[PDB]
Design an enzyme around this catalytic site. Structure first.
Site, PDB file in Angstrom:
ATOM      1  N   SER A  47       0.799  -1.219   0.000  1.00  0.00           N
ATOM      2  CA  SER A  47       0.000   0.000   0.000  1.00  0.00           C
ATOM      3  C   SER A  47       0.838   1.280   0.000  1.00  0.00           C
ATOM      4  O   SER A  47       0.264   2.350  -0.209  1.00  0.00           O
ATOM      5  CB  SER A  47      -0.964  -0.008   1.191  1.00  0.00           C
ATOM      6  N   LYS A  50       0.260   3.477  -2.978  1.00  0.00           N
ATOM      7  CA  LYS A  50      -0.875   4.389  -3.102  1.00  0.00           C
ATOM      8  C   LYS A  50      -0.376   5.827  -3.287  1.00  0.00           C
ATOM      9  O   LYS A  50      -1.100   6.667  -3.816  1.00  0.00           O
ATOM     10  CB  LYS A  50      -1.796   4.238  -1.895  1.00  0.00           C
ATOM     11  N   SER A  95      -6.282   2.683   3.561  1.00  0.00           N
ATOM     12  CA  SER A  95      -5.586   1.780   2.637  1.00  0.00           C
ATOM     13  C   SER A  95      -6.576   0.948   1.831  1.00  0.00           C
ATOM     14  O   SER A  95      -6.498  -0.281   1.773  1.00  0.00           O
ATOM     15  CB  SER A  95      -4.614   0.866   3.380  1.00  0.00           C
ATOM     16  N   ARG A 227       5.019  -0.794  13.299  1.00  0.00           N
ATOM     17  CA  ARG A 227       5.576   0.013  12.219  1.00  0.00           C
ATOM     18  C   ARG A 227       5.747   1.457  12.663  1.00  0.00           C
ATOM     19  O   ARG A 227       6.825   2.047  12.513  1.00  0.00           O
ATOM     20  CB  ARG A 227       4.681  -0.058  10.983  1.00  0.00           C
TER      21      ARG A 227
END
Length: 242
Positions: A47, A50, A95, A227
Protein backbone atom coordinates in the site's frame (compact mmCIF):
# COMPACT_ATOMS: atom_id res chain seq x y z
CA UNK A 1 26.99 10.70 3.45
CA UNK A 2 25.57 7.56 5.05
CA UNK A 3 26.04 6.39 8.63
CA UNK A 4 25.13 3.00 10.10
CA UNK A 5 23.82 3.03 13.69
CA UNK A 6 23.23 -0.52 14.89
CA UNK A 7 22.13 0.75 18.31
CA UNK A 8 18.67 1.15 16.74
CA UNK A 9 18.53 -2.66 16.40
CA UNK A 10 17.52 -2.72 20.07
CA UNK A 11 14.17 -1.20 19.10
CA UNK A 12 13.51 -4.20 16.85
CA UNK A 13 14.90 -6.98 19.06
CA UNK A 14 13.13 -5.70 22.19
CA UNK A 15 9.88 -6.36 20.27
CA UNK A 16 11.13 -9.73 18.96
CA UNK A 17 11.31 -8.18 15.49
CA UNK A 18 13.77 -7.51 12.66
CA UNK A 19 13.77 -4.65 10.20
CA UNK A 20 15.33 -1.42 9.00
CA UNK A 21 14.77 2.26 9.62
CA UNK A 22 16.26 4.81 7.22
CA UNK A 23 16.36 8.52 8.12
CA UNK A 24 17.43 11.47 5.94
CA UNK A 25 18.27 14.90 7.38
CA UNK A 26 17.28 17.30 4.61
CA UNK A 27 19.22 20.29 5.99
CA UNK A 28 22.46 18.33 6.34
CA UNK A 29 21.97 15.92 3.40
CA UNK A 30 23.01 13.04 5.63
CA UNK A 31 21.39 9.63 5.96
CA UNK A 32 21.24 7.17 8.85
CA UNK A 33 20.19 3.52 9.10
CA UNK A 34 20.57 0.53 11.39
CA UNK A 35 21.19 -1.87 8.50
CA UNK A 36 22.87 -0.65 5.31
CA UNK A 37 22.19 -3.95 3.53
CA UNK A 38 18.47 -4.12 4.30
CA UNK A 39 18.11 -0.39 3.59
CA UNK A 40 18.96 -1.27 -0.03
CA UNK A 41 17.03 -4.55 -0.34
CA UNK A 42 13.96 -4.30 -2.57
CA UNK A 43 10.48 -5.34 -1.42
CA UNK A 44 6.97 -5.21 -2.76
CA UNK A 45 5.67 -1.68 -2.01
CA UNK A 46 2.16 -2.91 -1.15
CA UNK A 47 0.00 0.00 0.00
CA UNK A 48 2.93 2.45 -0.06
CA UNK A 49 2.26 2.37 -3.80
CA UNK A 50 -0.87 4.39 -3.10
CA UNK A 51 1.42 7.45 -3.15
CA UNK A 52 2.55 7.12 -6.80
CA UNK A 53 -0.83 5.66 -7.81
CA UNK A 54 -2.64 8.71 -6.41
CA UNK A 55 -0.27 11.08 -8.23
CA UNK A 56 -0.78 9.36 -11.57
CA UNK A 57 -4.56 9.15 -11.16
CA UNK A 58 -4.77 12.87 -10.36
CA UNK A 59 -2.44 14.02 -13.12
CA UNK A 60 -4.32 12.04 -15.78
CA UNK A 61 -7.76 13.14 -14.56
CA UNK A 62 -8.80 9.66 -13.43
CA UNK A 63 -9.35 11.37 -10.06
CA UNK A 64 -10.80 14.87 -10.31
CA UNK A 65 -9.87 16.08 -6.82
CA UNK A 66 -9.75 14.94 -3.22
CA UNK A 67 -13.54 15.32 -2.83
CA UNK A 68 -14.61 13.00 -5.65
CA UNK A 69 -16.57 10.10 -4.16
CA UNK A 70 -15.65 6.55 -5.18
CA UNK A 71 -18.81 4.60 -4.45
CA UNK A 72 -18.58 1.24 -2.70
CA UNK A 73 -19.15 -1.48 -5.27
CA UNK A 74 -21.47 -3.30 -2.87
CA UNK A 75 -19.16 -6.30 -2.43
CA UNK A 76 -18.72 -7.08 1.25
CA UNK A 77 -15.03 -7.35 2.11
CA UNK A 78 -13.39 -8.38 5.38
CA UNK A 79 -12.12 -4.85 6.15
CA UNK A 80 -15.20 -3.05 7.47
CA UNK A 81 -13.87 0.41 6.60
CA UNK A 82 -13.64 -0.69 2.95
CA UNK A 83 -17.43 -1.35 2.76
CA UNK A 84 -18.35 2.30 2.32
CA UNK A 85 -17.90 5.27 0.02
CA UNK A 86 -14.47 6.90 -0.04
CA UNK A 87 -12.66 9.93 -1.40
CA UNK A 88 -8.91 10.23 -1.90
CA UNK A 89 -8.32 11.31 1.70
CA UNK A 90 -10.23 8.46 3.33
CA UNK A 91 -9.08 5.89 0.75
CA UNK A 92 -5.50 6.55 1.69
CA UNK A 93 -6.24 6.76 5.42
CA UNK A 94 -7.85 3.30 5.35
CA UNK A 95 -5.59 1.78 2.64
CA UNK A 96 -8.62 0.96 0.53
CA UNK A 97 -7.17 -1.46 -2.03
CA UNK A 98 -10.28 -1.88 -4.25
CA UNK A 99 -10.50 1.87 -4.90
CA UNK A 100 -6.87 1.96 -6.02
CA UNK A 101 -7.30 -1.18 -8.11
CA UNK A 102 -9.92 0.70 -10.13
CA UNK A 103 -7.54 3.67 -10.45
CA UNK A 104 -4.91 1.33 -11.89
CA UNK A 105 -7.32 -0.19 -14.42
CA UNK A 106 -8.30 3.27 -15.68
CA UNK A 107 -4.67 4.41 -15.78
CA UNK A 108 -3.74 1.35 -17.83
CA UNK A 109 -0.47 -0.53 -18.31
CA UNK A 110 1.13 1.84 -20.81
CA UNK A 111 0.65 5.08 -18.87
CA UNK A 112 1.40 3.44 -15.52
CA UNK A 113 4.71 2.07 -16.78
CA UNK A 114 5.88 5.32 -18.34
CA UNK A 115 4.94 7.34 -15.27
CA UNK A 116 6.82 5.02 -12.92
CA UNK A 117 9.88 5.41 -15.16
CA UNK A 118 9.42 9.19 -15.10
CA UNK A 119 9.30 8.96 -11.29
CA UNK A 120 12.42 6.73 -11.20
CA UNK A 121 10.26 4.63 -8.86
CA UNK A 122 11.94 1.47 -7.61
CA UNK A 123 12.63 -1.07 -10.32
CA UNK A 124 9.93 0.57 -12.48
CA UNK A 125 8.58 -2.91 -13.33
CA UNK A 126 4.80 -3.35 -13.44
CA UNK A 127 4.93 -6.99 -14.58
CA UNK A 128 1.86 -8.85 -13.40
CA UNK A 129 -1.79 -7.85 -13.34
CA UNK A 130 -2.38 -4.12 -13.77
CA UNK A 131 -4.84 -4.17 -10.84
CA UNK A 132 -2.53 -5.96 -8.39
CA UNK A 133 1.15 -5.71 -9.45
CA UNK A 134 2.09 -3.72 -6.33
CA UNK A 135 0.77 -6.61 -4.23
CA UNK A 136 1.93 -9.71 -6.11
CA UNK A 137 3.63 -8.56 -9.33
CA UNK A 138 7.20 -7.72 -10.21
CA UNK A 139 7.53 -4.18 -8.82
CA UNK A 140 10.05 -3.74 -6.01
CA UNK A 141 11.40 -0.78 -4.06
CA UNK A 142 13.96 -0.36 -1.27
CA UNK A 143 13.79 1.88 1.78
CA UNK A 144 16.49 4.15 0.36
CA UNK A 145 14.56 4.31 -2.92
CA UNK A 146 11.40 5.30 -1.04
CA UNK A 147 13.29 8.23 0.47
CA UNK A 148 14.61 9.35 -2.93
CA UNK A 149 11.05 9.36 -4.28
CA UNK A 150 9.57 11.13 -1.23
CA UNK A 151 12.19 13.89 -1.40
CA UNK A 152 11.14 14.62 -4.98
CA UNK A 153 7.47 14.74 -3.93
CA UNK A 154 8.24 17.07 -1.02
CA UNK A 155 10.03 19.52 -3.36
CA UNK A 156 7.33 19.26 -6.10
CA UNK A 157 10.02 17.89 -8.42
CA UNK A 158 8.14 14.86 -9.74
CA UNK A 159 7.06 14.98 -13.37
CA UNK A 160 3.40 15.64 -12.59
CA UNK A 161 1.71 18.96 -11.89
CA UNK A 162 2.33 20.93 -8.70
CA UNK A 163 -1.39 20.56 -7.94
CA UNK A 164 -1.23 16.76 -8.10
CA UNK A 165 1.72 16.72 -5.70
CA UNK A 166 0.05 19.13 -3.26
CA UNK A 167 -3.11 17.01 -3.21
CA UNK A 168 -1.23 13.78 -2.53
CA UNK A 169 0.77 15.41 0.27
CA UNK A 170 -2.52 16.56 1.81
CA UNK A 171 -3.81 12.98 1.58
CA UNK A 172 -0.64 11.72 3.30
CA UNK A 173 -1.31 13.81 6.41
CA UNK A 174 -1.10 11.39 9.35
CA UNK A 175 -0.31 13.41 12.48
CA UNK A 176 0.13 17.06 13.46
CA UNK A 177 0.64 18.88 16.73
CA UNK A 178 2.55 21.88 18.01
CA UNK A 179 5.88 20.04 17.64
CA UNK A 180 5.79 18.27 14.27
CA UNK A 181 3.77 17.18 11.25
CA UNK A 182 3.97 13.64 9.84
CA UNK A 183 2.96 12.89 6.25
CA UNK A 184 3.28 9.18 5.58
CA UNK A 185 1.79 5.98 4.20
CA UNK A 186 1.71 2.50 5.71
CA UNK A 187 2.15 -0.73 3.81
CA UNK A 188 1.52 -4.40 4.54
CA UNK A 189 2.89 -7.00 2.11
CA UNK A 190 1.61 -10.57 2.57
CA UNK A 191 1.31 -12.18 -0.88
CA UNK A 192 5.06 -12.65 -1.46
CA UNK A 193 7.64 -13.73 1.10
CA UNK A 194 8.99 -12.29 3.30
CA UNK A 195 5.82 -10.72 4.72
CA UNK A 196 6.64 -7.16 5.80
CA UNK A 197 5.18 -3.92 7.05
CA UNK A 198 6.19 -0.50 5.72
CA UNK A 199 5.97 3.05 6.98
CA UNK A 200 7.39 5.75 4.71
CA UNK A 201 7.05 9.51 4.81
CA UNK A 202 8.57 12.48 6.58
CA UNK A 203 8.51 14.61 9.71
CA UNK A 204 8.17 18.37 9.22
CA UNK A 205 9.77 20.59 11.86
CA UNK A 206 9.91 24.38 12.12
CA UNK A 207 13.40 24.46 10.58
CA UNK A 208 14.09 21.05 8.98
CA UNK A 209 12.48 17.98 7.43
CA UNK A 210 13.47 14.41 8.32
CA UNK A 211 12.51 11.81 5.73
CA UNK A 212 12.01 8.24 6.90
CA UNK A 213 11.41 4.81 5.43
CA UNK A 214 11.14 1.62 7.46
CA UNK A 215 10.18 -1.97 6.85
CA UNK A 216 10.05 -4.92 9.20
CA UNK A 217 9.17 -8.60 9.24
CA UNK A 218 5.43 -9.08 9.78
CA UNK A 219 4.62 -12.79 10.20
CA UNK A 220 1.15 -11.92 11.54
CA UNK A 221 -1.01 -8.82 11.56
CA UNK A 222 -0.59 -8.69 15.35
CA UNK A 223 2.55 -6.58 14.95
CA UNK A 224 1.27 -3.89 12.57
CA UNK A 225 1.27 -1.18 15.24
CA UNK A 226 5.03 -1.68 15.59
CA UNK A 227 5.58 0.01 12.22
CA UNK A 228 4.78 3.42 13.70
CA UNK A 229 5.86 2.55 17.25
CA UNK A 230 9.37 1.44 16.29
CA UNK A 231 9.82 4.41 13.94
CA UNK A 232 8.78 6.86 16.64
CA UNK A 233 11.13 5.26 19.18
CA UNK A 234 13.97 5.92 16.73
CA UNK A 235 12.73 9.47 16.18
CA UNK A 236 12.61 9.98 19.95
CA UNK A 237 16.11 8.56 20.46
CA UNK A 238 17.49 10.95 17.85
CA UNK A 239 15.66 13.88 19.50
CA UNK A 240 13.73 14.60 16.30
CA UNK A 241 10.42 14.47 18.18
CA UNK A 242 9.95 14.86 21.97
Amino acid sequence: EWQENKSWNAHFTEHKSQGVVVLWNENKQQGFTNNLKRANQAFLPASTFKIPNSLIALDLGVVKDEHQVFKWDGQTRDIATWNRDHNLITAMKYSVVPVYQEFARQIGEARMSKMLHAFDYGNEDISGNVDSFWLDGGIRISATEQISFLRKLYHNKLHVSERSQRIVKQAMLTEANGDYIIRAKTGYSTRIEPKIGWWVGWVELDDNVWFFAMNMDMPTSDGLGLRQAITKEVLKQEKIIP
